[PDB]
Design an enzyme around this catalytic site. Structure first.
Site, PDB file in Angstrom:
ATOM      1  N   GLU A  61       0.842  -1.209   0.000  1.00 35.77           N
ATOM      2  CA  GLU A  61       0.000   0.000   0.000  1.00 35.77           C
ATOM      3  C   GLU A  61       0.862   1.237   0.000  1.00 35.77           C
ATOM      4  O   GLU A  61       1.872   1.273   0.709  1.00 35.77           O
ATOM      5  CB  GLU A  61      -0.905   0.029   1.225  1.00 35.77           C
ATOM      6  CG  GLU A  61      -1.882   1.200   1.314  1.00 35.77           C
ATOM      7  CD  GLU A  61      -2.912   1.233   0.191  1.00 35.77           C
ATOM      8  OE1 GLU A  61      -2.799   2.129  -0.697  1.00 35.77           O
ATOM      9  OE2 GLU A  61      -3.842   0.389   0.220  1.00 35.77           O
ATOM     10  N   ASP A  89      -2.329  -5.012   1.051  1.00 29.55           N
ATOM     11  CA  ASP A  89      -1.582  -3.953   1.737  1.00 29.55           C
ATOM     12  C   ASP A  89      -0.133  -4.298   2.166  1.00 29.55           C
ATOM     13  O   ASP A  89       0.709  -3.398   2.254  1.00 29.55           O
ATOM     14  CB  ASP A  89      -2.378  -3.549   2.972  1.00 29.55           C
ATOM     15  CG  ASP A  89      -3.700  -2.924   2.616  1.00 29.55           C
ATOM     16  OD1 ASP A  89      -3.665  -1.998   1.776  1.00 29.55           O
ATOM     17  OD2 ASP A  89      -4.745  -3.336   3.182  1.00 29.55           O
ATOM     18  N   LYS A 115     -14.734  -7.178   3.424  1.00 28.64           N
ATOM     19  CA  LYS A 115     -13.440  -7.484   2.843  1.00 28.64           C
ATOM     20  C   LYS A 115     -13.371  -8.901   2.349  1.00 28.64           C
ATOM     21  O   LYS A 115     -12.932  -9.143   1.239  1.00 28.64           O
ATOM     22  CB  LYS A 115     -12.290  -7.257   3.847  1.00 28.64           C
ATOM     23  CG  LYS A 115     -11.937  -5.806   4.057  1.00 28.64           C
ATOM     24  CD  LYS A 115     -11.292  -5.144   2.847  1.00 28.64           C
ATOM     25  CE  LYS A 115     -10.760  -3.781   3.286  1.00 28.64           C
ATOM     26  NZ  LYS A 115     -10.213  -2.964   2.196  1.00 28.64           N
TER      27      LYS A 115
HETATM   28  C1  LIG Z   1      -7.668   3.161  -0.436  1.00 26.12           C
HETATM   29  C2  LIG Z   1      -7.882   2.112   0.467  1.00 26.12           C
HETATM   30  C3  LIG Z   1      -6.986   1.041   0.468  1.00 26.12           C
HETATM   31  C4  LIG Z   1      -7.158  -0.028   1.353  1.00 26.12           C
HETATM   32  O1  LIG Z   1      -6.392  -1.013   1.384  1.00 26.12           O
HETATM   33  C5  LIG Z   1      -8.247   0.034   2.234  1.00 26.12           C
HETATM   34  O2  LIG Z   1      -8.374  -0.967   3.144  1.00 26.12           O
HETATM   35  C6  LIG Z   1      -9.146   1.070   2.207  1.00 26.12           C
HETATM   36  N1  LIG Z   1      -8.950   2.126   1.337  1.00 26.12           N
HETATM   37  C7  LIG Z   1      -9.920   3.062   1.394  1.00 26.12           C
HETATM   38  C8  LIG Z   1     -10.080   3.904   2.466  1.00 26.12           C
HETATM   39  C9  LIG Z   1     -11.143   4.806   2.512  1.00 26.12           C
HETATM   40  C10 LIG Z   1     -12.093   4.878   1.491  1.00 26.12           C
HETATM   41  C11 LIG Z   1     -13.063   5.806   1.554  1.00 26.12           C
HETATM   42  N2  LIG Z   1     -13.748   6.263   0.490  1.00 26.12           N
HETATM   43  N3  LIG Z   1     -14.557   7.186   0.998  1.00 26.12           N
HETATM   44  N4  LIG Z   1     -14.346   7.307   2.283  1.00 26.12           N
HETATM   45  N5  LIG Z   1     -13.431   6.472   2.666  1.00 26.12           N
HETATM   46  C12 LIG Z   1     -11.936   4.021   0.384  1.00 26.12           C
HETATM   47  C13 LIG Z   1     -10.868   3.107   0.363  1.00 26.12           C
HETATM   48 MN   LIG Z   2      -6.580  -2.128   3.199  1.00 32.56          MN
HETATM   49 MN   LIG Z   3      -4.597  -1.408   0.016  1.00 29.01          MN
END
Ligand SMILES: Cc1cc(=O)c(O)cn1-c1ccc(-c2nnn[nH]2)cc1
Ligand SMILES: [Mn+2]
Ligand SMILES: [Mn+2]
Length: 175
Positions: A61, A89, A115
């Site tokens: 990530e 990640d 998830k």
């Molecule tokens: C971008 C992202 C990568 C990951 O691995 C993960 O677990 C979550 N996110 C992520 C985190 C937050 C959001 C989000 N979108 N709108 N509000 N929060 C969308 C995706």
């Molecule tokens: Mn994640």
């Molecule tokens: Mn991710």
């Protein structure tokens, strides 16, 4: 926006930059989608912290997609493990598995299920802003001290958000 200011003050600039670049490249503005901005910073930081409590872990990530896929393909070729359809990640060189990390404003079981439904044998570890966590087969990967640091940081974000009257907005924007 207090929320924008909040993000620039509680997260270190590299996290802010990375979160900003990610958003702007997909045509999303961090001054408008501010709760998303903070959630992306919060998730990034949890990934970086988790990596630092090990060279046990490879951070996937936060890299651009070329590098992330380069890292994933190099791990798949040299261990024999199956390629994920989505970038996870982290990779755990001890237990020899990828990890997907989740951070949730709702209940951990609910987010865990989402998830799992989006995914191989990627290991899933979910954290909340309440100190609850859930993980595949209840295998929490890290020792308690490392887990306790993440939860403390996450609880502190919440509390800071609450100080500035931002937590109610932030809570109801996951969906
Ligand atoms: C971008 C992202 C990568 C990951 O691995 C993960 O677990 C979550 N996110 C992520 C985190 C937050 C959001 C989000 N979108 N709108 N509000 N929060 C969308 C995706
Ligand atoms: Mn994640
Ligand atoms: Mn991710």
């Amino acid at each position: 926006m207090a929320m924008e200011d909040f993000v620039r003050q509680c997260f270190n600039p590299m996290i802010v930059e990375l979160a900003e670049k990610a958003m702007k490249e997909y045509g999303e503005d961090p001054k408008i989608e501010t709760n998303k901005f903070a959630a992306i910073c919060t998730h990034l930081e949890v990934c970086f912290m988790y990596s630092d409590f090990g060279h046990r872990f490879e951070i996937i990530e936060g890299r651009d997609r070329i590098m992330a896929w380069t890292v994933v393909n190099s791990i798949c070729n040299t261990t024999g493990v199956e390629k994920p359809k989505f970038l996870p990640d982290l990779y755990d060189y001890k237990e020899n598995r990828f990890i997907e990390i989740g951070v949730t404003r709702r209940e951990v079981h609910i987010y865990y299920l989402e998830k799992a439904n989006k995914i191989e044998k990627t290991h899933i570890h979910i954290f909340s802003f309440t100190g609850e966590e859930m993980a595949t087969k209840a295998d929490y990967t890290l020792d308690e001290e490392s887990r306790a640091r993440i939860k403390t940081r996450l609880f502190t974000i919440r509390q800071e958000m609450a100080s500035r009257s931002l937590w109610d907005s932030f809570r109801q924007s996951e969906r």
